[PDB]
Write a protein that binds this ligand. Structure first.
Ligand code: ZN
Length: 264
DNA sequence: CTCTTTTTTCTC
DNA sequence: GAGAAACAAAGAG
């Protein structure tokens, strides 16, 4: 559930529920709704989906211009539109009923969260969570990026995973990015040379953008997993130097890299 | 079998 | 700057 995959879901839902009126909201795992499902039911029932935007890995349902629904898929949250009488599968937790169908949210690990936030609190929400700039040449200022990177001793992969220097990078794309920029995941940010930072900054925007267009690496119906150079390729040869991709643990996360291309 | 492995928040 | 917790199932051997 990284920015590429979340953006793919935003567009799918975008062209399938925007403008639809909500008839009622049923929940079998209500606590998932951190702000009180009851309060959410009383307020979104009988509304219209105005739009579905995204910020980092968070989906934002715009229902009426009073409240915004912040949705986060965590590790395996997943939406799907199905028949009104469709049967209830094992890990379905919420359903948004429409006049002609329903939006179902599933999540095996129950990690996912839902939040109803008044329109004016959207920005303070992300600013309170310290979410960095979207991965675009316009919002991802390289200088600020360089500045933050030389001021820290944090290891690169962990630090990128924080969403602070930039938003959207998860385990898959950080490994892809770091390899594409020839930076070892344990390299301390304050040692990075500008040319490295510059290459990193660009590889970030580049790979996340490439992923968006390939529909994300949905192991839905995405094709980015077909172009992964190191994530999960443990034991396979490096696209460039041919060395065997190694897998190690960094800050508790499976980390794939190349011993040679990624020096550090 | 049995153990390992698969986003964000919080406690230090 | 680490570790744990939430939680459930595929994967490895
Ligand atoms: Zn290599």
């Amino acid at each position: 559930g990284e920015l590429p995959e979340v953006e793919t879901v935003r567009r799918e839902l975008e062209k399938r529920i925007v403008g639809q009126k909500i008839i009622s909201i049923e929940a079998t795992y209500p606590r998932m709704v951190l702000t009180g499902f009851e309060q959410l039911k009383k307020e979104l029932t009988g509304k219209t989906i105005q739009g579905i935007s995204r910020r980092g890995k968070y989906l934002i349902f715009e229902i009426g211009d009073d409240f915004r629904l912040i949705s986060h898929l965590r590790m395996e949250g997943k939406y799907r539109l199905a028949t009104l009488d469709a049967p209830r599968e094992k890990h379905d937790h919420l359903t948004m009923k429409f006049a002609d169908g329903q939006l179902i949210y599933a999540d095996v690990r129950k990690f996912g969260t839902w939040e109803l936030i008044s329109t004016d609190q959207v920005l303070p929400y992300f600013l309170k969570k310290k979410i960095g700039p979207e991965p675009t040449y316009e919002d991802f200022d390289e200088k600020l990026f360089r500045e933050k990177l030389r001021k820290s001793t944090k290891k690169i992969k962990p630090y990128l995973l924080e969403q602070t220097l930039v938003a959207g990078l998860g385990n898959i794309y950080v490994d892809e990015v770091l390899w594409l920029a020839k930076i070892h995941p344990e390299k301390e940010t304050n040692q990075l040379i500008e040319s490295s930072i510059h290459l990193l900054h660009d590889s970030i925007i580049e790979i996340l953008q490439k992923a968006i267009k390939l529909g994300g690496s949905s192991i839905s119906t995405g094709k980015m997993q077909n172009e992964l150079q190191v994530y999960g390729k443990t034991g396979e040869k490096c696209s460039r130097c041919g060395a065997e991709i190694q897998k190690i643990k960094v800050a508790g996360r499976g980390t794939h890299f190349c011993p040679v291309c990624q020096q550090k």
